[PDB]
Symmetry: D2
Subunit: 336 residues, 4 copies
C-alpha cells in the first residue's frame, strides 16, 4: 500500500519518521510521495532536523524534485489543489495521509479521490459524516469499505481511552475537560492578524496563557457513542512547543476513591493507553508512543455529603502520541 | 504606622512600589526599613528594574546601608533571624510585612514580636491559628486586636471572591480547582536538587508543564467558612514568568445557565474583584490591581439529564494582584 | 498632514501609539486611516492589548469599518494592493507610513503615489535609489522634495549613531557586527515551511539560537557615507519577543582605551542616542525611545603588541526604538 | 579506576550517562559512588528524566542510600565538606570527578586528597597552578604524575580547537570573543538576590538577554600557550536551556578568504572538533559529542584596504559537549 503524505508539516514529517522507524512492523505500507508548498531542499532539512524531536538518525538529502532517505527517493510535489497532485499516475499512490489542515472534511478530502487515490486518513476531526477512529478505543469499527476516515485530534486521542475506561467501569453522568496544551502553528509568534480573526489566537504564543476552544469533549460521542452529549470542555494554550495534558472532571454513577479509579483505569493499559506513575512532567512526555498517558498521581476525588467530583488526568505528546495513533490505524487500515 | 518589609523579594518589592504609587491614598503607612540577605546596591537595583513589571518611575540608588528613593532613605539590614533585626529601635518599625517565605506561621512570625514589632501581616498562608484575610471577602473580620495575620496566597485571593459570589447566589455543594500558574522562585531554572526534594519542583521551570500541590481550595473555609470541606484542587505550573488563571468546576444547588452565572458574579464586582469580558490573555493581566479578575468568556455550564457542572474562571497577576490585596488589608489594618 | 498607515503590524500599531502619546508634540501630523488584511475588530483589539508593550491607556473599540480611540474614528481598509486603497479621496491621506514589509523599494512604494498619496516613509531598508534616514545621524539630508524615503532597519538605527561617533572621534578602518536580536514575525513559531525557504528561518523561533543574515552593517554607507565598504556583520536571533543588542568590533585609526571610547561616544548623547551605564538587560530596554542605547559597561578594547580591537555595544528596542526614530523623521518630514 | 562524582548536577549526571553509554569504550573506569546535598530518590529521578537531554534508556531507582541502574547499586552521600565523604574506605573511590562548582581550585580540591582520593579532575577552570586540558588540543601535556587537573569550561572547550587551528595555520595577532550562551544554574529564574550579588546575574534568565563576564578567552594561554595575552571576550546569556555558540573576531598574520579559513580549520576535524556545514541551529547541537562544532556557514572575513577582520564561529552543547570532553580526558587520564 503506497502512501502519499499531503502536508509535510509536524504531523506529516513525524508520520514519515514513525513509519520508517517501525521498520518490519510497517511492512504493509510505505511512503512513496509527498506534497507541500515548498522546496524538496527545505522538506529534507526539516525531516532531518527537528527542534523538539531531535535529529532523524538517517541520511537525508534532496534532489531538484525529491527527498532522499538512506538512498531511497521520495517524490515531492508543490500542488495547492489536491485533485492536481499526480502521484497516483507518477508514484502509484494508493492511500493519502491528509495532514495539511486544509482538507478536514469528507467533501474536501474527496479531492484526493478525484486525483485517483483510493483511501484517505485525515490527521484531524473532519465532521460526523464519516468515522472517527481512536486506536485502542473503536478501531474495530473500521472496515475495508471506508474511503475517507478521521483520526480525530490529539486531544480526542488523549481523552477517549480515559473516558472509555471510566464509562465501562463506573459510568459517566456528565463531565468537563480542560487541556493544558502546547502551542501549535495555528497560533502567532507575536501579536498580529491571524487567519480566522480570533482575538486570542492572534496573541504571541510563547509568552501567554491563551484560552482556546476545542470540540474534543463535545464530539466524543463519535468515538465513544455512550458519552454522546455528556462532555464538554476547552483548552489553555501555554508556552511549551510540544507536550500537553488533559484534565477531566466527572460525575460518575458510583461513589469511588482515587485508588479505585486508578486501579480500574490501569485495566485498560495498552500500547495506545499508557499508565505512568513516575511523577513526570511535559518534557518527559515527548516521544512517548501511546495516544494517552494516564497519570494516577494527579487523580483527585472530591466529596461533600452525597456529592462527588472525580478529576482524572492524562498526558500526551500532542504531535507524536497522535502520530503514533494515526500510524496504528494506518497499519490496521492496510491489514484490511 | 512604620512598616518594615522582611524579604525584599518579588512581593516585598512590589508592595514597596504599590505603597509609594498610591501616594496620598497610603498616607497612614510608610515603609521605613527593609531586611534581606543581600547588598543595598542589589536591592535598589531590583526595585528599580523589574523584568516583568517594568522600570519603577522614580530615582533609585543605594548607600552603604540603605536604598534611596526620590531622595528619601530606607534602611537595609541583612539579618537571617528576625528577632535580630533592630529596626524597631533604629527605625521605629511598628509593623512587619513578612514576605520572606520563611516565617509562614504564627509561632515563627512571633520572632518579629520578640524584635519589638507590634503587628505582622504575612504574605502567605500561615496556618489556621490566626485569621486569613482576602480583602473584599472577609476583611470585616479584622480587628485592631489581631497581632499576626495572613493575607492568604495569590491563589486564595483569586479563588475566594469567585466562590463567595457563587456561594451567596446559588450555593456550592462541592467543587474542584485547577490553577494554570506562572512559575515562581520555589521552582528550578534547570533540573536539579530543589529544597524539599519534590520530584516535580526539581524540574526546569521555563520549559515544562509541571503539576503542583496547592491547599488554596482545601483551606478556603478560613476565608469563606461556609465552604469548609467543600473544595479541593491543584496547580499546573507553566512557562510564563507571571500571570495566572484559576478554573473552578462546581456542583451548585440550583440549575443555572452560563449567562445567569456571569450576571450573578458581576454583582460582586469591586476594586478587589474585577469583571473582564475583553478576551484577554495572561500578559494583559500583568499589572492589574484586583485580587481576582473574573472572565465571563470562559464560563461553561455542562448538563446531562439532571446533572450539571459549572466551570468558572478568574485571572490573577499572582505577584501584583496579590500585592495590591495585601496593601488593601494593610491600609485597613492601619485605619484600625 | 494626514497619515495613512499601511500595515497595522507591530510597527504600524506602535507608531500609532507613539504619535498619539506625543500629544502636542505631534501636532503637525495625525493618523487618519489604516490598511491591513483583517477586521477592524481585530485591529482595535491588537492596538489596545500588546503582549510586550502592555495595554494602551486609551479607550479603544471598533465599528464595522473603523477603529475608535477615545471617541475619534480611524477608517480601516483591507486592500492587498496599495494603489487600490481609496484613503486619499475618502480620508484625505497626504502621507503613507508604509509598514507592511511588502513594499520595501521605491518602485513598489510608488503604488501609494499612484493611489494619490504625496509622500511615503518606509519602515525598512528599501534600496539605494532613495535616501535612508537615521534620525540623529543624517536627518539634515532630508528635504521637502523627497517623495519616497527609508527609515532603515532597527539594526541600522542601533548601529549608525555608534559608528558615527566612532568615525568622527577616532576613525574606523574596518569593523564587523553581530546583533543578538529578538525573534520577529518573519520567523516560525514551530519548525516548518517559511516564506523564502531559508533553512534557518524555518526553525522554531522561541526555542533556538538562529543565525540570520543582515545587511545593516554592509549598507551603512547610505547613512554614514564615510564608512561605505568598511563594515559587515550578521545576526543571532534568540528567544526574546522584543529587545535586541548590537555589538561592533572595530579597528580604529587611533590607539584608545575603553574609558576614552566611552567618553567620546557620550559626547553624542541625544534623544536618538542614549548612554546607559546602569547594568541593564534586554527587558529594561523595552519602551526606551532612543534609536540606540550605548552600553559603556560592555566596552572592551583588546590589545596585543601594535594591534588593537575595539568592541562597542548598543541596546535597542527593535520595535519601539525604531518606531520612535521613524516618528522623529516623520515629524521633521512634516515640518518641511 | 573507581570514580566518585562530587556534585550530581547537570555535569555530574551527564558524565554518569556518557560513561555508561560508552560501554566497552569506558572499561578502564566506572562510577562507584556519588555525593550531593539531597536524597537518593531525587538523584535517581534526575538521572532518569532530563528536561533537555531526554529520558535515560536504562532502569533507574533508589534505595535509602543509593541509586540503582540496571540492577547495579551506586552509593550516594550528602556530605557538604569533601574531606568528609567516606567513599574511599566505603567504596574504593580512586578518582574524583569534581562537579559541584564549589571546589574550583587546587587548594579546595585538595579536600578530596585529604579524604584519600588519589586524583581529581575538576569540571571547571580552577586557576593557573595546575594544568587545564582541552582534549584534542593539549591532552598530550597530561601525565600520570598530575594529581589535580582542570577540564576548563564549556567555553574554553568551544574556543581552544578553533583558535589552535587558526594559530597553527595563519597565526593570530589579537582577537575578541562573544559567546551567545544558554542560561545556567548560576542565574536566577526570576529577578532576585543572587549569590555574589551581580546586578545582571540577578535577572530573570529565561526572559532576558543578559551580558556576562567570562575568562575563557583571556585564560586561553593555559591551553594554547602561544595565544597567551592575545584574546579577550564576554558572553551574552540568552533564553535557551542548553546549546551555545562562540564567535571569535581575529586579526590574523596573513590575508585570508572565508573559504581558505574554512578549508584550513577542516584539517583539524576530530571527535573533539566537529565541522558542520548543514545550517544547524542550537537545538540541533544538543547531544553532539564534540567539544566544539565549527560552523563554516558563519565564517566572515571583512576587508577594507590593508585591514582585515576574520569572524569564525563554533557551536557547543555547553552541557554535553563539555561532558564528553571531560570523559575523553578521564579515559586518557585512566590509561596512564
Ligand atoms: N500539531 C499538533 O499537535 C496536531 C495534533 C493532532 C492533529 N493536528 C492536525 O494536523 C494537521 C496539520 O498540523 P501541523 O501541526 O502538522 O500543521 P503544520 O503547519 O506544521 O503543517 C501543515 C503543512 O501543510 C502544508 N500545506 C498547507 N496547505 C497545503 C496545501 N493546500 N497543499 C499541500 N500542503 C499544504 C504546509 O506548508 C505545512 O507544511 C492539522 O489538521 C492539525 O489540526 C495537529
Ligand atoms: N511570587 C508570587 O506569585 C507569590 C504570590 C503570593 C504569595 N507569595 C508568597 O510570598 C512570599 C515570598 O515570595 P516571593 O515570590 O517574593 O519570593 P522571593 O524569592 O522573590 O523573595 C524572597 C525574599 O526573601 C529573602 N529572604 C529569604 N530568607 C530570608 C530571611 N531569613 N530573612 C530575610 N530575608 C530573607 C530572599 O533573599 C528573597 O529576596 C512566599 O511566602 C510566597 O509563597 C508569592
Ligand atoms: N518588528 C521589528 O522589530 C522591526 C524593526 C524595524 C523594521 N521592521 C520592518 O517593519 C515592517 C513590518 O514589521 P512588523 O514587525 O510590523 O511586521 P508584522 O507582521 O507585525 O506586520 C505586518 C503587517 O502588515 C500587514 N500586511 C501584510 N501584507 C499587507 C498588504 N499587502 N497590504 C496591507 N497590509 C499588509 C499584515 O497583516 C501585518 O499586520 C517590515 O518591513 C519589517 O522588516 C520591523
Ligand atoms: N552547566 C554547564 O553548561 C557547564 C559547562 C561547563 C562547566 N560547568 C561547570 O560545572 C560545575 C557544575 O555545573 P552544573 O551546571 O552541573 O551545576 P548544577 O547546579 O547543576 O550542579 C551542582 C551540583 O552540585 C551539588 N552541590 C553543591 N554544593 C555541593 C557540595 N558542597 N557538596 C556536594 N555537592 C554539592 C548541587 O546540589 C548540585 O546538584 C560548575 O563548576 C560549572 O561552572 C558547567
Amino acid at each position: 500500500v503506497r502512501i502519499g503524505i499531503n502536508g509535510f508539516g509536524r504531523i506529516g514529517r513525524l508520520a514519515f519518521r514513525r513509519i520508517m522507524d517501525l521498520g518490519e512492523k510497517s511492512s504493509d505500507i510505505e511512503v512513496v510521495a509527498i506534497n507541500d508548498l515548498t522546496t524538496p531542499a527545505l522538506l529534507a532539512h526539516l525531516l532531518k532536523y527537528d527542534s523538539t524531536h531531535g535529529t532523524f538518525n538517517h541520511e537525508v538529502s534532496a534532489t531538484d524534485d525529491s527527498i532522499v532517505v538512506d538512498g531511497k527517493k521520495y517524490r515531492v510535489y508543490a500542488e495547492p489543489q489536491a485533485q492536481n497532485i499526480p502521484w497516483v499516475k507518477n508514484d502509484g499512490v494508493d492511500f493519502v495521509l491528509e495532514c495539511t489542515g486544509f482538507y478536514t472534511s469528507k467533501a474536501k478530502s474527496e479531492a484526493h479521490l478525484k486525483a485517483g487515490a483510493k483511501r484517505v486518513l485525515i490527521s484531524a476531526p473532519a465532521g460526523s459524516d464519516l468515522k472517527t477512529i481512536v486506536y485502542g478505543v473503536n478501531d474495530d469499527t473500521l472496515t475495508a469499505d471506508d474511503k475517507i476516515v478521521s483520526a480525530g485530534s490529539c486531544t480526542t486521542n488523549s481523552l477517549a481511552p480515559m473516558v472509555n475506561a471510566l464509562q465501562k467501569e463506573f459510568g459517566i453522568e456528565v463531565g468537563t475537560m480542560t487541556t493544558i496544551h502546547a502551542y501549535t502553528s495555528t497560533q502567532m509568534l507575536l501579536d498580529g492578524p491571524v487567519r480566522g480573526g480570533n482575538l486570542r489566537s492572534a496573541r504571541a504564543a510563547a509568552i501567554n496563557i491563551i484560552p482556546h476552544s476545542t470540540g474534543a469533549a463535545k464530539a466524543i460521542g463519535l468515538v465513544v457513542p455512550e458519552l454522546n452529549g455528556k462532555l464538554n470542555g476547552h483548552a489553555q494554550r501555554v508556552p511549551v512547543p510540544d507536550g500537553s495534558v488533559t484534565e477531566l472532571v466527572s460525575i460518575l454513577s458510583k461513589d469511588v476513591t482515587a485508588d479505585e479509579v486508578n486501579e480500574a483505569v490501569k485495566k485498560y493499559e495498552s500500547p495506545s493507553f499508557a499508565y505512568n506513575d513516575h511523577n513526570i512532567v511535559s518534557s518527559d512526555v515527548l516521544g512517548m508512543t501511546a495516544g494517552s498517558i494516564f497519570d494516577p498521581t494527579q487523580t483527585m476525588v472530591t466529596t461533600a455529603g452525597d456529592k462527588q467530583l472525580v478529576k482524572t488526568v492524562a498526558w500526551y505528546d500532542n504531535e507524536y502520541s497522535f502520530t503514533c495513533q494515526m500510524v496504528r490505524t494506518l497499519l490496521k487500515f492496510a491489514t484490511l
